[PDB]
Design a protein around this ligand. Structure first.
Ligand SMILES: *[C@@H]1O[C@H](CO)[C@@H](O)[C@H](O)[C@H]1NC(C)=O
Ligand SMILES: *[C@@H]1O[C@H](CO)[C@@H](O)[C@H](O)[C@H]1NC(C)=O
Lengths: 434, 49
């Protein structure tokens, strides 16, 4: 017997329901989400880190004009200097007086510590959910994990679940993200093949050990002022360190709906934003005969000290007139009230107490005990505690949020004004008759 | 829970109250002033005999 419903997305906050076949007894149904991860399909453009800006040895020849071929190495900057006359230890290095040529070479390369201190640039497409459910139908615990696509049944021993598509997934990741050491940033990195000096992604490669390193650091070779054999060069600062200087806060601190970002794989676990349609096919082994279940001949309810809040605040007493011994579920058939308990053992002619949570100052909600429905009407007080450590289990519907007496005053003034208009118009009609 | 109430300053004479909570049962509250003392802040001006 399939049953369709819509569960809130929030992890925790167990969700109650009552399934009911025409010839079978009403049966408890529990749907609760223990985990929910958003795993998007991501591809990798480039890795980046500190460059080493290694400088090879000078190529000095003594009064012969030489030029350097354009090497394919990363950020290759090469220059020739005439009129040099080098000195390293041991005196002059060229015999020939004042026409010697020095060749200065410079190129960049990943630092030795780039295996840990590297940032990986990702493009993030649309994400899909993989939510874990616990189903407590017929006091039989069933833990499962299922995708939210509407086409994937959940692997269970005797249960079939379909998770309908999300109303609106919000995708916390932007189209371009950057991952550094488990910290995820929504950064608009430049495209591969586009580099700016002193900016993020100034040096790029397909992998950490890739040969095709590419960079456009603003490196310039200068003429050696002192008569030695050093290579004087200047270069713009690494954009990796300049990005770490003002990276801002990562996605683990700046993310909507309060869900935590994890890496390997990139995912956003325990997000709470929408609603999942659940089509669940309860096996018939849990459905029991209506004759076996003790029906309730008469039931009445009262509410004592209703405190409407996020906690299970509010107690209701049910006076039942059961016929035979057994146990059968309870349920609350209002969107504003959620009952704490699932089933109740009833022998005959007794009293039970139940706990519920509401977001409305008026408690006008129908309780179904074991098949039979009776409504309960009472008043609920606002809580004294301003801040509570657990989330609300019900949502305000904006019509039950207005209290019963405030509804009475507002409807009384509106009805008095409207009836005053009606009596004015009928006096007009009576006067026009004359 | 914080209960704010008003008790007479009579020694002895137990004072009754009810602590009603929306999430718990009402509780008996007894307040008895077993003793009091009104100690002034004094200074010695002089001593004579
Ligand atoms: C950047 O680094 C400098 C050090 O040169 C430091 O003074 C500064 O606070 C950092 N952050 C910003 C936002 O400039
Ligand atoms: C629910 O509990 C009852 C009594 O504890 C037990 O007999 C029954 O097997 C449980 N339900 C199912 C569907 O197994």
């Amino acid at each position: 017997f399939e049953h369709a419903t819509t569960v809130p997305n929030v992890p925790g906050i167990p969700y109650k329901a009552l399934v009911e076949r025409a010839g079978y007894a009403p049966l408890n149904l529990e749907i609760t989400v223990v985990s929910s991860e958003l795993t998007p399909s991501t591809n990798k453009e480039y890795v980046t880190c500190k460059f080493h800006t290694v400088v090879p040895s000078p190529q000095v020849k003594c009064c012969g004009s030489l030029e350097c071929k354009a090497s394919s190495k990363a950020d290759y900057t090469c220059r020739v200097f005439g009129g040099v006359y080098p000195f390293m230890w041991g005196g002059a290095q060229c015999f020939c007086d004042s026409e010697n040529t020095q060749l200065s070479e410079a190129y960049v390369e990943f630092a030795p510590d780039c295996t840990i201190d590297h940032a990986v640039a990702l493009k993030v497409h649309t994400a899909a959910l993989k939510v874990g459910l616990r189903i407590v139908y017929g006091n039989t615990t069933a833990r499962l994990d299922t995708f939210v696509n509407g086409v994937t049944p959940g692997s269970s021993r005797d249960l079939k679940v379909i998770a309908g598509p999300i109303s609106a997934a919000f995708s916390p990741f932007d189209h371009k993200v950057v991952i550094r050491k488990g910290l995820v940033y929504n950064y608009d990195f430049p495209e591969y093949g586009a580099m700016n000096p002193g900016a993020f992604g100034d040096i790029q490669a397909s992998s950490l050990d890739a040969t095709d390193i590419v960079a456009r650091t603003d490196i310039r070779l200068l003429k050696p002022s002192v008569k030695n054999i050093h290579v004087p060069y200047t270069q713009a600062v690494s954009g990796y360190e300049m990005w770490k200087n003002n990276s801002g806060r990562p996605l683990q601190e700046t993310a909507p709906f309060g869900c935590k970002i994890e890496v390997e794989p990139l995912r956003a676990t325990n997000c709470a934003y929408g609603h999942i349609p659940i089509s669940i096919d309860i096996p018939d082994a849990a459905f029991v005969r209506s004759s076996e279940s003790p029906t309730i001949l008469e039931v009445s309810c009262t509410v004592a000290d209703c405190i409407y809040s996020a906690d299970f605040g509010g107690s209701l007493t049910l006076q039942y007139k059961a016929n035979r011994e057994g146990h059968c579920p309870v349920h609350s058939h209002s969107t504003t009230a959620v009952l704490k308990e699932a089933t109740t053992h009833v022998t005959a002619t007794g009293s039970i107490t139940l706990h519920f949570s509401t977001s409305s100052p008026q408690a006008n909600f129908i309780v179904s005990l074991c098949g039979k429905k009776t409504t309960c009407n009472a008043e609920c007080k606002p809580p004294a505690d301003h801040i509570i450590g657990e989330p609300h289990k019900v949502d305000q519907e904006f019509q039950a949020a207005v209290s019963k007496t405030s509804w009475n005053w507002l409807l009384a003034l509106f009805g008095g004004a409207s009836s005053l208009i009606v009596v004015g118009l009928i006096v007009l009609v009576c006067s026009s008759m004359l």
